[PDB]
Swiss-Prot record, chain A:
GO terms for biological process: endonucleolytic cleavage of tricistronic rRNA transcript (SSU-rRNA, 5.8S rRNA, LSU-rRNA); endonucleolytic cleavage to generate mature 3'-end of SSU-rRNA from (SSU-rRNA, 5.8S rRNA, LSU-rRNA); maturation of SSU-rRNA from tricistronic rRNA transcript (SSU-rRNA, 5.8S rRNA, LSU-rRNA). Interacts with RIO2. One of its GO terms (molecular function) is GTP binding. Required for 40S ribosomal subunit synthesis. Required for normal export of the pre-40S particles from the nucleus to the cytoplasm. Its subcellular location and association with pre-40S subunitshifts from mixed cytoplasm/nucleus to all nuclear in RPS19 disruptions, suggesting it acts after the ribosomal protein. Residues 1-35 are annotated as: Disordered. It is found in: Cytoplasm; Nucleus, Nucleolus. Keywords: Cytoplasm, Nucleus, Ribosome biogenesis. Residues 1-21 have a biased composition (Basic residues). This is Ribosome biogenesis protein TSR1. Residues 60-222 form the Bms1-type G domain. It comes from the Eukaryota. Belongs to the TRAFAC class translation factor GTPase superfamily. Bms1-like GTPase family. TSR1 subfamily. It comes from Saccharomyces cerevisiae (strain ATCC 204508 / S288c) (Baker's yeast).
UniProtKB/Swiss-Prot annotation, chain B:
This is Small ribosomal subunit protein uS12A. Present with 10600 molecules/cell in log phase SD medium. There are 2 genes for uS12 in yeast. It is found in: Cytoplasm. The stereochemistry of the 3,4-dihydroxyproline has not yet been determined. Component of the ribosome, a large ribonucleoprotein complex responsible for the synthesis of proteins in the cell. The small ribosomal subunit (SSU) binds messenger RNAs (mRNAs) and translates the encoded message by selecting cognate aminoacyl-transfer RNA (tRNA) molecules. The large subunit (LSU) contains the ribosomal catalytic site termed the peptidyl transferase center (PTC), which catalyzes the formation of peptide bonds, thereby polymerizing the amino acids delivered by tRNAs into a polypeptide chain. Belongs to the universal ribosomal protein uS12 family. Component of the small ribosomal subunit (SSU). Mature yeast ribosomes consist of a small (40S) and a large (60S) subunit. The 40S small subunit contains 1 molecule of ribosomal RNA (18S rRNA) and 33 different proteins (encoded by 57 genes). The large 60S subunit contains 3 rRNA molecules (25S, 5.8S and 5S rRNA) and 46 different proteins (encoded by 81 genes). The chain holds residues 98 to 145 of 145 of the full protein. The gene is RPS23A. Signal peptide: none annotated.
Length: 619, 48
RNA sequence: GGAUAGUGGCCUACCAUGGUUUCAACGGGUAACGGGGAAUAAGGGUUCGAUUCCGGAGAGGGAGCCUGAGAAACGGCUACCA
RNA sequence: UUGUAUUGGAAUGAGUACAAUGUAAAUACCUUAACGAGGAACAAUUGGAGGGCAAGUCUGGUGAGCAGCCGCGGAUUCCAGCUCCAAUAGCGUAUAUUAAAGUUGUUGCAGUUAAAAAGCUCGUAGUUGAACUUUGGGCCCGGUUGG
RNA sequence: GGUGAAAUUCUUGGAUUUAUUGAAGACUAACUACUGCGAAAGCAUUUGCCAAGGACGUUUUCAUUAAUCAAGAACGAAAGUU
RNA sequence: ACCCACUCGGCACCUUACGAGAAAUCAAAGUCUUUGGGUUCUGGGGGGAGUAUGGUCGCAAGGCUGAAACUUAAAGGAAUUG
């Protein structure tokens, strides 16, 4: 324009015309104060609503579990020293589950003791507790091969709350300052796993043991997310009726139960309940979901994986052809692509190696908007709720009766399923290695995975994590030595994103188990296409100002012609293309972005579709 | 999700920091353990 | 005139029409107990003082009262509200 | 007489402990017989290395990370290893406040063109308001400090 | 007639143009400027009436009666309202 | 009426800068870190915004007074030049 324009601190009316196309309240001191008071009334009423569940003998019991980390201890010493401070000897037998009422704190406690021989039974016991009491020895320090693995495993499945306890520190008395030196060491060790806690009690002192007892009675535990969104109960008694109709009585602790649900027992699988009653009766009204799943030579094997993984780490996906081998018949299935992130590979491809189940598989899409929606309905439909004394009748196959034990001697526990979780789908897991598991893991090798209560034998497929616009990703032969990774298989879905633990059975080990890794249920996503990449390679050997010719990549003129269209690249990063076959031995000549030399190598990439394998329960 | 976290100001007295549009706070602790200790492998997070 | 340990609209009867204010009355706000003091050193200032000493007020919220030289007391009593 | 590496005697408390002292009785400090260092493992951390602002043309990887601000990266600013710098039994971060700040200005800001002189004149409260009245000169006493 | 070009319009009962006269409402050319007056907005043909004002001149008179100004008050282009 | 000298008051102009200023420039925009002649009004980075809400004046159109949450690292002034 060329003119110094007009200025004003606020817009002129001329400017506004071109651009074109209840009372406020003062808070008086009284009403300020009044609002704060009536807000506090809500908070206080809300705190009562939480606590009523534990309020007394009429309320629910709190579930305590004792876990000694050293066999030196004997768990009966732990419990006995606690019971003394209750100051009622009427409290203080051929059994490992105990119900106690404490007059001193008007509190109901259930104590469960696991059988320390059965490592897997420890996890199952601790999985249901509100409080886990860790026993430590002042005399002998925990062993890395067993004692620590208890702590590490419990953390990764999740713990409602934890207490550190000592019971025998006087066994190293000279002066109690020497006891304090040891106690400081144990606290520093314990805090490494549980940095929220800074105290370990000495039960040899009356003041500490009373302090522990008070806490168990008075304080509330944390919730466990994946558990409390389901229902669960612990059996007070079990009974059998005629193929069976197994009866359990106990207390509701989760979100709740409905007689039309499905019920999982961790050792035995899914079963249907037929009736419920409250200690009114509820019956399975047949407008219900149903039980349908659809609609020394080993040294050579270990050495093989050790050698193969070392090779794959140096020269990944490189392949050797051989003379008298047809490249077509070997490789015709491979499509060949410029870039996985840009290819239009179809998900539910019709190729014959695709599993027989496809329409048979459940597919969800928006897992997030599915998960939260399902829960909202489930909590509304609950019939029995926390603290209800209940009986339940369950369709129980009579031949499994040989596996039942008296619940007074062994933990028997019951979990409700979410509706579609019985159906199989494509599922995805995060995975990273256990604390020092340096062994090679082959992508096809079978593994046992626990996630939530249930556990399955799985053969995975490994891939790296990224957000490709098409969900196509490279299949990988072995688990990366360091990064987190994504593993894919077919299994029954979980909506709660339970933590997952990865291990392999090994009865040669003291705990019968070898621990491999941990992770999380990410999602069901069938679009998570895996492509098996292959690299062929050949040697450029003669060089001209406009073309280079390459040996050994192919051995027949017919093969050079059939694969002519796939682009070439150098590992030094130049691209190129086949011109034509030269001669009968399968030489070719090619053009590239620039100068090559015999110190470079010429490669080409090809890709094949992969599909997940199915999986089966484990016990 | 449903973790508990402790938050602190992102250093600019109520303004957002640098490149990041409208982000004013940074995480300091999760579940009662500090992120710096986790990053350097000094402590371990118990799940929930 | 009554009442009080005693002065005084402190209260009662009768009578007069006064009292404060742009030198900010009256009203509203304070995440306001006051002071000795604390941090920050060119000088002038700015910000803070629930808290070891001095003074005031209260004992879940309002009101009433016995004993005693002294209390409108709450590790004294009586009633209502929660 | 000063640096860089194989080798030798001396010195000591942290810690433990007889005793006395301490104290209402004790613990600890102060004192002390015996024991107590050679990778003297009896092993010091917390933040940084483009500029503001002390200190890397080092070297390997990569093409999500860093950054209060300016900026780096499709690498002196990311990640890893050497080396170097700063404070040190302490060092970093968030929020509030003071100084540097003459961005609250009495001391001490600014108003043509950068934020800011009211269209114009009258006028009450408020702040402010010309000059002038015993000045000069003598004579004693006289304290302090230095000649 | 009007435009870059053209059409609506007026006219052989005479348009446009020429001559002699008359009516109405508005305006005050050239002279007119680096000139004048007014608190600002603003003010230009002649003559009469009414009241006001600055500067100059002064060996007149009073003797501090003064400067700026919240509240309050007079005036205020063009367009706009009854 | 005009010419020459002087003087009070007024609208302007030319040259210069002991002075001042970021510079254009300025007889005041000078007598300022060597900072105090009297007195009135207004501003405190750019947007949200002359918006919302309350009041008050007008027949109406509208006038006067006038925020905050939130957002952002610049917006702006003078001058010469590739």
């Amino acid at each position: 324009n060329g003119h110094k324009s007009y200025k004003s601190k606020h817009a002129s009316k001329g400017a506004l015309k071109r651009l074109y196309k209840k009372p406020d309240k003062q808070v008086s001191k009284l009403q300020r104060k009044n609002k704060a008071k009536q807000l506090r009334a809500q908070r206080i009423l809300d705190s009562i609503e939480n606590r009523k569940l534990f309020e007394g003998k009429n309320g629910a019991a709190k579930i305590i579990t004792i876990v000694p980390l050293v066999n030196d201890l004997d768990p009966l010493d732990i419990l006995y020293k606690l019971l003394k401070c209750a100051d009622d000897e009427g409290i203080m037998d051929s059994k490992r589950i105990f119900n106690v009422h404490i007059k001193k704190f008007k509190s109901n406690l259930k104590i469960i003791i696991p059988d320390m021989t059965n490592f897997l039974n420890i996890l199952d016991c601790a999985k249901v507790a509100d409080f886990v009491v860790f026993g430590l020895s002042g005399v002998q320090e925990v062993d890395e091969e067993f004692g620590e693995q208890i702590i590490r495993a419990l953390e990764l499945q999740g713990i409602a709350s934890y207490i550190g306890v000592i019971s025998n520190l006087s066994a190293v008395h000279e002066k109690e300052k020497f006891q304090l030196d040891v106690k400081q060491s144990l606290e520093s060790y314990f805090k490494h796993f549980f940095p929220s806690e800074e105290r370990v009690y000495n039960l040899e002192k009356n003041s500490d043991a009373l302090n522990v007892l008070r806490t168990l009675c008075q304080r509330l535990p944390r919730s466990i997310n994946w558990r409390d969104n389901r229902g669960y109960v612990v059996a007070d008694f079990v009974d059998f009726v005629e193929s069976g109709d197994l009866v359990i009585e106990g207390t509701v602790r989760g979100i709740g139960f409905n007689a039309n649900r499905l019920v999982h027992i961790p050792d035995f699988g899914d079963f249907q309940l037929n009736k419920i009653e409250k200690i009114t009766v509820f019956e399975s009204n047949m407008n219900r979901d149903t039980l349908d799943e659809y609609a020394e030579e080993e040294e050579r094997q270990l050495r093989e994986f050790r050698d193969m993984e070392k090779e794959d780490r140096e020269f990944p996906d490189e392949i050797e052809l051989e003379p008298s081998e047809s490249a077509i018949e070997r490789l015709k299935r491979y499509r060949g692509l410029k870039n996985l992130y840009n290819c239009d590979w179809q998900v539910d491809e019709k190729d014959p190696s695709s599993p027989a189940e496809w329409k048979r598989l459940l597919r969800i899409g928006n897992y997030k908007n599915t998960k939260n929606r399902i829960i909202k309905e489930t909590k509304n439909e609950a019939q029995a709720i926390a603290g209800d004394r209940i009986r339940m009748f369950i369709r129980f196959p009579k031949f499994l009766l040989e596996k039942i034990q008296d619940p007074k001697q062994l933990l028997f526990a019951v979990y409700g399923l979410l509706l579609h979780e019985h159906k199989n789908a494509v599922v995805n897991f995060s995975l990273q290695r256990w604390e020092q598991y340096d062994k090679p893991v082959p992508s096809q090798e079978p593994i046992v995975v626990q996630y939530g209560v249930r556990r399955y034998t799985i053969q995975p497929l490994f891939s790296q994590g990224s957000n490709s616009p098409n969900n196509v990703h490279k299949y990988e032969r072995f688990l990366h030595p360091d990064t987190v990774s994504v593993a894919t298989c077919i299994a029954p879905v979980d909506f709660t994103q339970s933590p997952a633990i990865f291990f392999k059975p090994s009865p040669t080990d003291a705990k019968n188990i070898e621990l491999i890794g941990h992770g999380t249920f990410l999602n069901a996503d069938h679009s998570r296409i895996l492509a098996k990449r292959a690299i062929l390679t050949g040697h450029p050997f003669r060089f001209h100002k406009t073309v280079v010719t390459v040996r050994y990549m192919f051995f027949r003129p017919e093969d050079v012609e059939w694969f002519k269209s796939i682009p070439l690249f150098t590992k030094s990063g130049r691209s190129g293309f086949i011109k034509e076959s030269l001669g009968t031995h399968g030489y070719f000549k090619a053009t590239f972005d620039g100068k090559l030399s015999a110190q470079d190598v010429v490669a080409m990439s090809l890709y094949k579709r992969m599909w997940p394998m199915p999986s089966l329960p484990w016990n | 999700e449903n973790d508990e976290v402790l938050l602190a100001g992102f250093g600019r007295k109520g303004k957002a920091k640098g490149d990041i549009p409208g982000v004013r706070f940074k995480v300091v602790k999760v579940s009662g353990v500090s992120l710096l200790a986790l990053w350097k492998e000094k402590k371990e997070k118990p799940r929930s």
